[PDB]
Each structure stands twice: as C-alpha cells, then as structure tokens.
Design a binder for these strands. Structure first.
Ligand SMILES: [Mg+2]
Ligand SMILES: [Mg+2]
Ligand SMILES: [Mg+2]
Ligand SMILES: [Mg+2]
Ligand SMILES: [Mg+2]
Ligand SMILES: [Mg+2]
Ligand SMILES: [Mg+2]
Ligand SMILES: [Mg+2]
Ligand SMILES: [Mg+2]
Ligand SMILES: [Mg+2]
Ligand SMILES: [Mg+2]
Ligand SMILES: [Mg+2]
Ligand SMILES: [Mg+2]
Ligand SMILES: [Mg+2]
Ligand SMILES: [Mg+2]
Ligand SMILES: [Mg+2]
Ligand SMILES: [Mg+2]
Ligand SMILES: [Mg+2]
Ligand SMILES: [Mg+2]
Ligand SMILES: [Mg+2]
Ligand SMILES: [Mg+2]
Ligand SMILES: [Mg+2]
Ligand SMILES: [Mg+2]
Ligand SMILES: [Mg+2]
Ligand SMILES: [Mg+2]
Ligand SMILES: [Mg+2]
Ligand SMILES: [Mg+2]
Ligand SMILES: [Mg+2]
Ligand SMILES: [Mg+2]
Ligand SMILES: [Mg+2]
Ligand SMILES: [Mg+2]
Ligand SMILES: [Mg+2]
Ligand SMILES: [Mg+2]
Ligand SMILES: [Mg+2]
Ligand SMILES: [Mg+2]
Ligand SMILES: [Mg+2]
Ligand SMILES: [Mg+2]
Ligand SMILES: [Mg+2]
Ligand SMILES: [Mg+2]
Ligand SMILES: [Mg+2]
Ligand SMILES: [Mg+2]
Ligand SMILES: [Mg+2]
Ligand SMILES: [Mg+2]
Ligand SMILES: [Mg+2]
Ligand SMILES: [Mg+2]
Ligand SMILES: [Mg+2]
Ligand SMILES: [Mg+2]
Ligand SMILES: [Mg+2]
Ligand SMILES: [Mg+2]
Ligand SMILES: [Mg+2]
Ligand SMILES: [Mg+2]
Ligand SMILES: [Mg+2]
Ligand SMILES: [Zn+2]
Lengths: 62, 120, 44, 119, 132
RNA sequence: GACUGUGUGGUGGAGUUGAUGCGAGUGAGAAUGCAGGCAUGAGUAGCGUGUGACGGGUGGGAAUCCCGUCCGCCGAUUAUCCAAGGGUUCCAGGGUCAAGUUUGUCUGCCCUGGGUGAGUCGGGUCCUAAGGCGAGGCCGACAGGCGUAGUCGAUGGGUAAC
RNA sequence: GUCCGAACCCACUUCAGUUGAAAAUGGAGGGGAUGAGUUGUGGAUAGGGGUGAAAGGCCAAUCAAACACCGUGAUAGCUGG
RNA sequence: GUACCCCGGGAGGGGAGUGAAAGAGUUCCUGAAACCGGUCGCAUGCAAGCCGUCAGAGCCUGUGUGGUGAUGGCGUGCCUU
C-alpha cells in the first residue's frame, strides 16, 4: 500500500509529538565522600561503589 | 539448570551453551567479569552449580567439573581457591551489579563476581 | 552474471585505436570531427 | 528587451496570501491553495451579504412573534393590525422595541388589537 | 535604513537581561533527533542538565551537554554568574546544511539519502529570572 | 478592476521617479511541462548468508581499533601463486570534514614521503597459424573491391639458473 | 553421441525474492557429464544486412529490421497546454 | 581573512580586535517563498468539519484597532474535457 494523500500538518504533528524520551532520573550517591549522581541500582561511575552508607562495596575500579 | 525460555544468546542455542560455559570459565579465571546484564544473570546459576560441585574435592568431582570449563587450570583454581573459600556458604557464591550502558549499542552492562570475603 | 563489457586492451586498440581509425576514410573523418569538437581523446 | 517576471508576479501573490491570512493548513501558506479558497470566500461573501437581509428579517420576526404572543396575539394578526392601523414601523424597529421598550411594544400590540377587523 | 542598535543574538535572546548563551552550528546530527533531547533539557537547572545528559542514552545528549557547558562558561566569564545558580532559560534546534547522497537499490534504482545537520542554541540565565 | 500612496517604519547599499511618446524575450496554477530547493510517507522499511566471549591497552570518546587468552568457522578452499583486468589501492608516518549502510582512535579513505633492480622468469630483439594489411597488379563511373611479391599477427613453435 | 556420479555446462519442478543480495538470482531437488562436450585467447561475418540443430531467436541489460548522428523544429483531421 | 583570552578533542560558539558596516567572517553583496523551529496571545479533549462565509458571546489587547473564536445559519475543491 501507498499513502494516498499528503498528511496534513495537524495529523503529522499529532503523530510526531509522541516520538519522545523520558529524562533519566539519577540518584545521589550514598557515599558522603562522593555525593555524585548515578543511576538507581547501579554502581556510581565516580566513586565506583555500591550499597548504603555502611556497606559501600567497590564495584568499578574507576 | 533452568532453560532460557526466550530466544538464546548468540543466535543459536549451541552458541549460547558455548558462551555460557566460556563466560563461567572466564569468571572463575579472573574473579570478576563485565559481561552485560542478561549474560551475567544467565551465567550465574551455572557458575554457582559449578562452585557448589567444587566445594567438595574428589577426583570424580574434578572430572565432572572438567566436563564443563574444560581448562584444567581453571578447574584447579575452582577446586583450590574458590572452593575452600565457600566452606560455610550455603549458595550465593556470586553477585551481579549493574554498571551503566554501552555507548555503542546501549547494552545495559553489569559485572558478575565471585564472593571474595570468607563467610566466617 | 556475465555482463556486456569484458575488457581486453588488445581488442580495444585494434578496434577503436588511432591506427584503426586512420586506416579507413570514415575513421579519418571521425578523427577530424572529434578534433573540430575539441575532444582530448581522439581515439581509444 | 528581456523581462523578468518576478517583480510583477509577486504582487497578486502577496494580495491573495494577505486575503487568506486566517485560513487553516495550506490555505494560508500556499498561493495556489489560498487562491482557490478566496474564490469560494468571495462567492460565499456575495451570497451571504444578500442572505443577511433575510436572516435578520427572520430574527426580527421571531422576536416580534415571541413578544406579541406574550400578549396573546400571534405575529400575523399583529402585523395585519399594524397595517390596518396605518403604523409603518418596520420589522427591526419593532424587534428593538420588543427587546428594549417592552411597554411601547405592548402599546403597539394594543393598537393592533384595536385595529383588528374583529371578524 | 541601516544605522545603530544593529541586531545581535544576545539582544534577541536576552535583551539587557543577565545571562549568556552558546550556539553549536553544523552539528552532524538530525534536527529532530536533537530536539528529542532539547525538549527534555529545556527549563532545567544547568548543572542538573549537564549531569543528566552525562547519563542520557541518546547520542544527541553529548553535543547538547557540551553546548550547555559552553553557555555556562560564557555566563561565568562575562557576567560573573556562578554555574550553580544558572538555569536553561531557552533551548532550541534549527536545521543546518543537508547533504544529498545516493543509496543503490534493487533493479538499478538509486534512492536519495539525506544527511542532515542541526544548530543548537542554549540560553542560560540566573535562577532569580525564573519568576520574572 | 488589473492594482496602488507624493503615508510611515525596518532591512539594504547604487541607482532611479513623474510627464509624454517609442519598442517588447510584457504578466503563469495546471502541459504525467523543465531546473533547483523542500515537505509527505517517517524517525517508518532496510543496514546485503554467519559466532563470538573476555582480560588488558590506547583515547576527549571503544560492542565495532590494537594486544593477549579462550571459543567457533573455512580447508579441492574463507589457503597459496599466476593470467586477464585494475593502476599506486602496496609500505611508513600524520589525520577523522567527506566516503564506510552503525560507531570508529580504524580503513582498500585523505595527506606527506617512500617502495617495483633480471644475459637465463613473462613479452620484444626470432618463427609462423587464423586473420589483417598489401609494391606492382587485376577489377570498379567516382568512392572503392580483391590480391601477387611481401609484411605483420599468439592463443602455438624456439629459447641459457638454481 | 553407453550407465551411475563431482568439477564443469545446463535450467525441469518447487519455495523464497519480486522498491530483490541480484534490471533474471538464491535454497532444495533436477538434465548432460568421452562428447553433436565444455572452456581460454585472438580472429571473421553488419542493419533489409549478418547469424540462426528455426524460437522471428540473437546481433552490447527492451530487435517483425540494432545503435549514433544528420534531413529535423519529420508529420499527426488526434490528446494536452 | 579575526592577534590574544575562555568553554570544547575538535567543530562551533563567547569576549576582544580590524572595518563605515562582521547579522559583510570566506557556505562571506542583497537574502524572497516553500520548509523547520523557540517564545507570547486566544481557541481546542461530547466532537461528523471542500475547512470557508454571514451572524456572534467570551478572552487578550487597546499600539482604543487589532488578534483569537465558543456557538448559530448557509455551503460538495481547481483545471481540463
Ligand atoms: Mg487521526
Ligand atoms: Mg522452554
Ligand atoms: Mg538478535
Ligand atoms: Mg550443534
Ligand atoms: Mg558491453
Ligand atoms: Mg417560529
Ligand atoms: Mg524604502
Ligand atoms: Mg546492477
Ligand atoms: Mg515612461
Ligand atoms: Mg513570456
Ligand atoms: Mg510559479
Ligand atoms: Mg523537480
Ligand atoms: Mg520527513
Ligand atoms: Mg520505534
Ligand atoms: Mg507505517
Ligand atoms: Mg514498524
Ligand atoms: Mg526493522
Ligand atoms: Mg550479517
Ligand atoms: Mg560484526
Ligand atoms: Mg584478536
Ligand atoms: Mg571446522
Ligand atoms: Mg581430501
Ligand atoms: Mg603493473
Ligand atoms: Mg598515496
Ligand atoms: Mg585511490
Ligand atoms: Mg595500506
Ligand atoms: Mg560513519
Ligand atoms: Mg587511522
Ligand atoms: Mg595508515
Ligand atoms: Mg625479421
Ligand atoms: Mg597470411
Ligand atoms: Mg597500390
Ligand atoms: Mg620475416
Ligand atoms: Mg612478430
Ligand atoms: Mg554418455
Ligand atoms: Mg567456470
Ligand atoms: Mg522455465
Ligand atoms: Mg513466487
Ligand atoms: Mg543418460
Ligand atoms: Mg574482431
Ligand atoms: Mg510464430
Ligand atoms: Mg539484448
Ligand atoms: Mg523499416
Ligand atoms: Mg525538409
Ligand atoms: Mg507538431
Ligand atoms: Mg484526454
Ligand atoms: Mg557612511
Ligand atoms: Mg543585515
Ligand atoms: Mg548560503
Ligand atoms: Mg548573505
Ligand atoms: Mg467541551
Ligand atoms: Mg449530519
Ligand atoms: Zn559515588
């Protein structure tokens, strides 16, 4: 099949506006010495650590 | 252990078997490995089965582990270092932690690592 | 598949070469016409 | 004497695009599509400037009908009564009286009632 | 008739208000794909925006993040503002030069390919201007 | 009415207004019209048979570059060497606009410099085949056709290294 | 001008492709496979002509008369503008 | 033909300089339309719309005219043939 007619501006924009992305949320690193933003349930790219203020196990050597 | 339900890694179940076995071998070789989320979570059960089998050291057990792995050096590592490291552990010999994503293809990445500290 | 052009330098020179064109009066007039037009390649 | 068309050509295009400066879609952006709607717009405006007389007369007649029926008199009898009484106040002023000066309209209704043939 | 108060990007975007801006011209990516991230980043605090764009998975995040950082630096240098009290007042993506290329297809046909490009503009002002 | 102001700005930077004549490549919405630019479909289909994994390195940036280790694939060919054809793609160093159906620090790409050595190898300097040309010549209004003596022409003969 | 069967040559069936990987192919089978075989290099035949184990087939990816240029801005009681 | 400085790997931009002019910065005179966007005003999620037209509230603006337009009526494109 082929598009019979050129789609109107209103309809094209109605469909196109739904092509979007949500913002990444980010969470503050539990390490007091780092305090950076990292993905939830993900090792902090700055400190390379994971876990609550206590645990704090190293995950990434960075 | 349990099969993978959905489509297999590497475009073929035989290749998935090869991938999981090699990935477990590399995990045992290096202690830790960054291997994306799905591969790590799929290799965890097999790796823990192998570690549990290696927790008790007999010639028959070493041959059974060598059925998998197939690198006797890695078998020696598993039966000498990893095995005795888990004398008191009742399972859970490995852990997986997410790292981020790959820039090239947005693969969610994670590191799977054998437990290092002694339970006692 | 096998396409129309199958190169052969010897065949090309024998067919569309300068001496081939000079052999016949039609080819000489072709060279003259290409000289009038201004082609940098008078022949193959 | 070669002549380039652009300077003279753009004038009608600017005129039409200005005339079509509230239209939806291509009708306000493209000269050819705006031109087609301006033909329809002109035809509709000419037709409606002549239908406006009838529309407003109908509105006046409806309002007069309502106001006179409030006094127990139909529009036809009211108009016949005014015609017989000889009061040539038209549908328009009568409707304005009905909306605004209802007492004057009611006095006219009484005039029409008295001027009825009573037959 | 040409004269004084000649137009400028700063005059058009800020107009005697404090703040600065930055333009990345001829970004070798599509304008729509840049807008997909511009819409998210518009209106945010600048530091939050750049930290988020370090984690945004789209490829448009990197050029937009660099533009925001450049605008922040321009503000810090030319108006004494601090990076932590700036917010992205404006942000938009216009279209730049497009290159026509050819992709061969079946049966000897050639299909047009458009390599698009974008201009990214970010305007940062002090957060006190948000309620003004 | 086609249109327009000797109203008032903006942009712009070198011409041009009114009167009256004169001359027209003098007016576009259609020709499945021509050229360019740009939408629509649409962030959609596709990304050209396949098996990669990991450790380390480089880097502003790495699934896609380098190194290593596992693993897999071809093996009458996914190996090696020629001819034809191509023509500098070869090597070293620098580069990441473009090109590469993604990324790219990488390249058969770009830039700069460099690289091919024969008495014996493959051709010529030797030989002829098919066929071509052809002194004179014969034939043909002209243009030309054919052909003798000859002279070319490898895909063959001849020819001294491992 | 034997038989079975790779290379090689072919193109019978089927499926896929049919904006294809490909302007005729790919997968699976299939015919010939010492012969009227197949293939490399060079050569010969040219458009009312060539060649044709003959289908009006083929003669540089559309041949009941190739292609290019010229007569030429052919002509069209027709269609469009 | 943009010294120098800043963000940036660069590209690009921000200051500053040159110039009468740099929104004349080499893709460089003038810079139209399609097309793509940011901002602001109004309308719009009970509605059947050749998209206009006539009537018309409300809001915005008042640069006291303009913008928008709830709602009612009427209303089947352009060209060719
Ligand atoms: Mg719809
Ligand atoms: Mg199952
Ligand atoms: Mg897949
Ligand atoms: Mg198998
Ligand atoms: Mg050919
Ligand atoms: Mg009634
Ligand atoms: Mg002026
Ligand atoms: Mg082709
Ligand atoms: Mg005059
Ligand atoms: Mg004309
Ligand atoms: Mg036109
Ligand atoms: Mg066109
Ligand atoms: Mg589009
Ligand atoms: Mg999608
Ligand atoms: Mg679709
Ligand atoms: Mg789809
Ligand atoms: Mg798809
Ligand atoms: Mg593939
Ligand atoms: Mg690959
Ligand atoms: Mg390797
Ligand atoms: Mg094999
Ligand atoms: Mg063998
Ligand atoms: Mg050579
Ligand atoms: Mg070179
Ligand atoms: Mg080259
Ligand atoms: Mg090379
Ligand atoms: Mg690329
Ligand atoms: Mg390189
Ligand atoms: Mg190199
Ligand atoms: Mg001799
Ligand atoms: Mg001879
Ligand atoms: Mg002679
Ligand atoms: Mg001789
Ligand atoms: Mg010779
Ligand atoms: Mg036989
Ligand atoms: Mg062959
Ligand atoms: Mg058939
Ligand atoms: Mg079919
Ligand atoms: Mg037989
Ligand atoms: Mg020949
Ligand atoms: Mg027949
Ligand atoms: Mg043919
Ligand atoms: Mg004929
Ligand atoms: Mg004639
Ligand atoms: Mg004619
Ligand atoms: Mg017709
Ligand atoms: Mg001056
Ligand atoms: Mg200007
Ligand atoms: Mg330009
Ligand atoms: Mg300009
Ligand atoms: Mg409602
Ligand atoms: Mg109805
Ligand atoms: Zn941290």
């Amino acid at each position: 099949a082929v598009p019979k007619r050129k789609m109107s501006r209103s309809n094209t924009r109605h469909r196109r506006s739904q092509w979007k992305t949500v913002a990444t949320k980010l969470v503050t690193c539990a390490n007091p010495a780092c305090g950076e933003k990292h993905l939830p349930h993900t090792a902090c790219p700055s400190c390379g650590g994971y876990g609550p203020r206590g645990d704090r196990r190293q995950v990434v050597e960075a | 252990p349990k099969p993978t339900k959905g489509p297999r890694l590497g475009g073929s179940p035989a290749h998935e078997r090869i991938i999981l076995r090699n990935l477990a071998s590399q995990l045992f070789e290096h202690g830790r490995v960054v291997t994306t989320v799905t591969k790590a979570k799929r290799v965890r059960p097999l790796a823990e089965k192998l570690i549990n089998r290696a927790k008790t050291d007999t010639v028959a057990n070493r041959r059974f582990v060598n059925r998998t792995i197939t690198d006797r050096g890695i078998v020696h590592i598993l039966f000498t270092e990893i095995g005795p490291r888990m004398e008191g552990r009742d399972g859970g010999y490995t852990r997986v932690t997410r790292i981020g994503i790959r820039k090239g293809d947005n693969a969610p990445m994670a590191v799977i690592e054998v437990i290092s500290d002694k339970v006692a | 598949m096998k396409r129309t052009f199958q190169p052969s330098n010897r065949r090309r020179a024998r067919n569309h070469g300068f001496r081939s064109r000079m052999s016949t009066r039609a080819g000489r007039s072709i060279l003259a016409a290409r000289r009038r037009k201004g082609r940098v390649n008078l022949s193959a | 004497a070669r002549v380039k068309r652009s300077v003279n050509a753009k004038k009608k295009r600017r005129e039409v695009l200005d005339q079509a400066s509230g239209y939806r879609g291509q009708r306000s952006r493209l000269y050819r599509k705006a031109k087609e709607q301006t033909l329809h717009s002109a035809t509709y405006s000419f037709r409606d400037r002549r239908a406006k007389k009838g529309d407003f007369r109908s509105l006046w007649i409806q309002r007069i009908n309502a106001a006179s029926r409030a006094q127990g008199m139909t529009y036809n009898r009211f108009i016949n009564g005014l015609k017989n009484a000889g009061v040539e106040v038209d549908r328009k002023m009568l409707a304005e009286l009905a909306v605004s000066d209802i007492n004057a309209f009611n006095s006219l209704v009484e005039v029409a009632k008295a001027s009825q043939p009573q037959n | 008739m040409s004269k004084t108060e000649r137009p400028s990007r700063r005059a058009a975007l800020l107009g005697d208000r404090p703040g600065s801006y930055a333009i990345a011209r001829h970004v070798r990516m599509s304008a729509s794909k840049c807008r997909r991230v511009i819409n998210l980043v518009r209106g945010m605090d600048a530091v939050d925006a750049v930290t988020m764009l370090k984690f945004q998975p789209q490829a448009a995040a990197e050029p937009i993040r660099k533009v925001i950082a450049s605008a922040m630096a321009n503000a810090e240098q030319t108006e004494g503002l601090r990076a932590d009290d700036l917010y992205i007042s404006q942000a938009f993506v216009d279209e730049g030069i497009t290159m026509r290329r050819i992709r061969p297809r079946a049966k000897g046909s050639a299909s047009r390919i458009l390599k698009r490009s974008a201009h990214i503009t970010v305007v940062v002002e002090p957060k006190e201007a948000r309620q003004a």
